[PDB]
Enzyme design. Structure first.
Site, PDB file in Angstrom:
ATOM      1  N   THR A 162      42.303  37.603  48.661  1.00  0.00           N
ATOM      2  CA  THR A 162      40.947  37.107  48.555  1.00  0.00           C
ATOM      3  C   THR A 162      40.812  35.960  47.549  1.00  0.00           C
ATOM      4  OG1 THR A 162      40.436  38.938  47.103  1.00  0.00           O
ATOM      5  CG2 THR A 162      39.786  39.176  49.386  1.00  0.00           C
ATOM      6  N   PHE A 214      31.601  40.480  45.159  1.00  0.00           N
ATOM      7  CA  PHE A 214      32.496  41.431  44.480  1.00  0.00           C
ATOM      8  C   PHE A 214      32.033  42.877  44.596  1.00  0.00           C
ATOM      9  CE2 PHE A 214      33.236  37.468  42.034  1.00  0.00           C
ATOM     10  CZ  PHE A 214      34.615  37.305  42.319  1.00  0.00           C
ATOM     11  N   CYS A 261      34.429  45.129  42.507  1.00  0.00           N
ATOM     12  CA  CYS A 261      35.766  44.598  42.195  1.00  0.00           C
ATOM     13  C   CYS A 261      36.151  44.807  40.732  1.00  0.00           C
ATOM     14  CB  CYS A 261      35.837  43.111  42.534  1.00  0.00           C
ATOM     15  SG  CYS A 261      37.458  42.425  42.397  1.00  0.00           S
TER      16      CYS A 261
HETATM   17  C1  HEM Z   1      37.709  35.999  44.793  1.00  0.00           C
HETATM   18  C2  HEM Z   1      38.517  37.046  44.680  1.00  0.00           C
HETATM   19  C3  HEM Z   1      38.102  38.504  45.015  1.00  0.00           C
HETATM   20  C4  HEM Z   1      37.090  38.957  45.784  1.00  0.00           C
HETATM   21  C5  HEM Z   1      36.016  38.141  46.549  1.00  0.00           C
HETATM   22  C6  HEM Z   1      37.136  40.403  45.778  1.00  0.00           C
HETATM   23  C7  HEM Z   1      36.263  41.275  46.418  1.00  0.00           C
HETATM   24  C8  HEM Z   1      36.156  42.653  46.260  1.00  0.00           C
HETATM   25  C9  HEM Z   1      35.183  43.514  46.926  1.00  0.00           C
HETATM   26  C10 HEM Z   1      34.070  43.048  47.879  1.00  0.00           C
HETATM   27  C11 HEM Z   1      35.416  44.792  46.574  1.00  0.00           C
HETATM   28  C12 HEM Z   1      34.600  46.034  47.024  1.00  0.00           C
HETATM   29  C13 HEM Z   1      35.116  46.624  48.343  1.00  0.00           C
HETATM   30  C14 HEM Z   1      34.216  47.705  48.906  1.00  0.00           C
HETATM   31  O1  HEM Z   1      33.111  47.975  48.370  1.00  0.00           O
HETATM   32  O2  HEM Z   1      34.600  48.340  49.931  1.00  0.00           O
HETATM   33  C15 HEM Z   1      36.540  44.773  45.656  1.00  0.00           C
HETATM   34  C16 HEM Z   1      37.091  45.882  45.047  1.00  0.00           C
HETATM   35  C17 HEM Z   1      38.334  45.929  44.441  1.00  0.00           C
HETATM   36  N1  HEM Z   1      39.082  44.843  44.037  1.00  0.00           N
HETATM   37 FE1  HEM Z   1      38.560  42.738  44.378  1.00  0.00          FE
HETATM   38  N2  HEM Z   1      38.221  40.784  45.025  1.00  0.00           N
HETATM   39  C18 HEM Z   1      38.837  39.651  44.516  1.00  0.00           C
HETATM   40  C19 HEM Z   1      39.944  39.651  43.683  1.00  0.00           C
HETATM   41  C20 HEM Z   1      40.577  40.782  43.196  1.00  0.00           C
HETATM   42  C21 HEM Z   1      41.676  40.806  42.237  1.00  0.00           C
HETATM   43  C22 HEM Z   1      42.267  39.500  41.623  1.00  0.00           C
HETATM   44  C23 HEM Z   1      42.054  42.115  42.055  1.00  0.00           C
HETATM   45  C24 HEM Z   1      43.153  42.739  41.124  1.00  0.00           C
HETATM   46  C25 HEM Z   1      43.773  41.999  40.180  1.00  0.00           C
HETATM   47  C26 HEM Z   1      41.178  42.951  42.871  1.00  0.00           C
HETATM   48  C27 HEM Z   1      41.237  44.336  42.943  1.00  0.00           C
HETATM   49  C28 HEM Z   1      40.294  45.208  43.449  1.00  0.00           C
HETATM   50  C29 HEM Z   1      40.381  46.645  43.464  1.00  0.00           C
HETATM   51  C30 HEM Z   1      41.507  47.560  42.949  1.00  0.00           C
HETATM   52  C31 HEM Z   1      39.080  47.120  44.103  1.00  0.00           C
HETATM   53  C32 HEM Z   1      38.656  48.578  44.314  1.00  0.00           C
HETATM   54  C33 HEM Z   1      37.834  48.856  43.048  1.00  0.00           C
HETATM   55  C34 HEM Z   1      37.351  50.298  43.030  1.00  0.00           C
HETATM   56  O3  HEM Z   1      36.732  50.750  44.036  1.00  0.00           O
HETATM   57  O4  HEM Z   1      37.601  51.000  42.013  1.00  0.00           O
HETATM   58  N3  HEM Z   1      40.284  42.110  43.540  1.00  0.00           N
HETATM   59  N4  HEM Z   1      36.978  43.449  45.485  1.00  0.00           N
END
Ligand code: HEM
Length: 451
Positions: A263, A388, A395
């Site tokens: 992403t 996010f 996120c």
């Molecule tokens: C522009 C970059 C990014 C975007 C747009 C993004 C977007 C998101 C979104 C929408 C979710 C929620 C998913 C849901 O509700 O089903 C999420 C959760 C998560 N993201 Fe990101 N992400 C990005 C970068 C990253 C990075 C760099 C990492 C790790 C270094 C990461 C790790 C995670 C993890 C582990 C979750 C699950 C969190 C939880 O439920 O405890 N993401 N992200």
């Protein structure tokens, strides 16, 4: 009062499915949203969801006392390989809160500052690749952005060098990841079969490839650091007192490798895409980079100073949020928007690109690329901008991603002039996540030395 929920046309037993016979389901769904508005039900044989598009309805869905994170069929298919790691765990699963508590300190500003130097290592390797291209040559943008983001999470998170820039084709892990993500996406539009036996068998093969890296990483930390891997191995939940068992850890490695890079790559591709299409924005973002990044390599504070570069990143997430959807379910019976009664368990899908096009919030020029919209973000209403996710399931990597992106885009803008040499026509590929497929440019070096 109790409204009837809008729904696209159904075709007997096929339900709404013939309307999503596409490789671009999210973009199709956006079309149905423009037709029916802020909410529509959508049925497929044996399954039903409700798509929300307006800030007023998504505000309510984001009330965690009433709705929790749901695993869409898509995340169910990915849970086949990411298990009960952070991204594919239910909130009521033991390992969710536990891994959350254990892994959160790895995203503290303290830790963020410690990642900066490793981020610059990979950024320089990118700039050097482009500095070393011959005149007859061009850059494949999503491909190189992917080299950067995979390598960055490998180094920062795990002290592993994927050495993605020493390979003219994608790293083996990427090729499997992409074929698996595509398949979880294809699986959704199948009504019911031995016609899909090979798809199932390539799917298992794609999983084993990914896992082969895990063991490689596991065995590398083994046979010889204060990072994500550390806290996975040593950390204990300040609640239950327990660490993560081996099985969960492997799910977390996998989770982070994928979500930790893909992403971010899409965001950098889109941002660059919008810059070369909006030359007055480019010039201004290029002015900021030259002025702020006065050193051969960028410092941590300088990245913080790249304010307009951050505005460009946010505006690109508004238009094309790279994780374009997140699902929720009703904790109990409830009424949505004062009109839609819902039953315990009913699913809701947040179509983020439609949310980000809500004219009642953004005005009537939603399709325009205008980083200045984010001039003073506290102005923007709550739950209007959600690239996010939401709440405790937002996120975890948000600040990591934005630090990485801002740093990298800043260096790009400082070091090159970009040419849209093929007059690139936007073509968004969906592997659940979004990226501009085939985006290519030419970068003429401003001949400024690195450190
Ligand atoms: C522009 C970059 C990014 C975007 C747009 C993004 C977007 C998101 C979104 C929408 C979710 C929620 C998913 C849901 O509700 O089903 C999420 C959760 C998560 N993201 Fe990101 N992400 C990005 C970068 C990253 C990075 C760099 C990492 C790790 C270094 C990461 C790790 C995670 C993890 C582990 C979750 C699950 C969190 C939880 O439920 O405890 N993401 N992200």
């Amino acid at each position: 009062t109790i409204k009837e929920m809008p729904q696209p046309k159904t075709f007997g037993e096929l339900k709404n499915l013939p309307l999503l016979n596409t490789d671009k389901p999210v973009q199709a769904l956006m079309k149905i949203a423009d037709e029916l508005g802020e909410i529509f039900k959508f049925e497929a044989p044996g399954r039903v969801t409700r798509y929300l598009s307006s800030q007023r309805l998504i505000k309510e869905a984001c009330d965690e006392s009433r709705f929790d994170k749901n695993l869409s069929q898509a995340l169910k298919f990915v849970r086949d390989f990411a298990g009960d790691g952070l991204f594919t765990s239910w909130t009521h699963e033991k390992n969710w809160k536990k891994a959350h508590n254990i892994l959160l300190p790895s995203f503290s500003q303290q830790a963020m500052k410690g990642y900066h130097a490793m981020m610059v290592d990979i950024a320089v390797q990118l700039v050097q690749k482009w500095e070393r291209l011959n005149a007859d040559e061009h850059i494949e943008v999503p491909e190189d952005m992917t080299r950067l983001t995979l390598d960055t999470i490998g180094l920062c998170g795990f002290n592993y060098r994927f050495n993605s820039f020493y390979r003219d084709q994608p790293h083996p892990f990427i090729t499997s990841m992409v074929r698996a993500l595509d398949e979880a996406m294809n699986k959704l539009q199948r009504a019911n079969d031995p016609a899909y036996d090979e798809n199932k068998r390539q799917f298992q093969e794609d999983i084993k490839v990914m896992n082969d890296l895990v063991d490689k990483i596991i065995a590398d930390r083994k046979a010889s650091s204060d990072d994500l891997l550390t806290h996975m191995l040593n950390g204990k939940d300040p609640e239950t007192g327990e660490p993560l068992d081996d099985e969960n850890i492997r799910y977390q490695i996998i989770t982070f490798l994928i979500k930790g890079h893909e992403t971010t790559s899409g965001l950098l591709s889109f941002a660059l895409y919008f810059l070369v299409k909006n030359p007055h924005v480019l010039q201004k973002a290029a002015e900021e980079a030259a002025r702020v990044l006065v050193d051969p390599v960028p410092s941590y504070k300088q990245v913080k100073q790249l304010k307009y570069v951050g505005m460009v990143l946010n505006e690109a997430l508004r238009l094309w949020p790279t994780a374009p959807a997140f699902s929720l379910y009703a904790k109990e019976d409830t009424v949505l928007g004062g009109e839609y009664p819902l039953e315990k368990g009913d699913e809701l899908m947040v179509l983020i690109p439609q949310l980000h096009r809500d004219k009642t919030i953004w005005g009537d020029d939603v399709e325009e690329f205008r980083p200045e919209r984010f001039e003073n973000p506290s102005a923007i209403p709550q739950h209007a901008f959600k690239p996010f996710g939401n709440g405790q399931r937002a996120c975890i990597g948000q600040q990591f991603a934005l630090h990485e992106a801002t740093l990298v885009l800043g260096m790009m803008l400082k070091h090159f002039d970009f040419e849209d040499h093929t007059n690139y026509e936007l073509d968004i590929k969906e592997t659940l996540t979004l990226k501009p497929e085939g985006f290519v440019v030419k970068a003429k070096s401003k001949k400024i030395p690195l450190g």
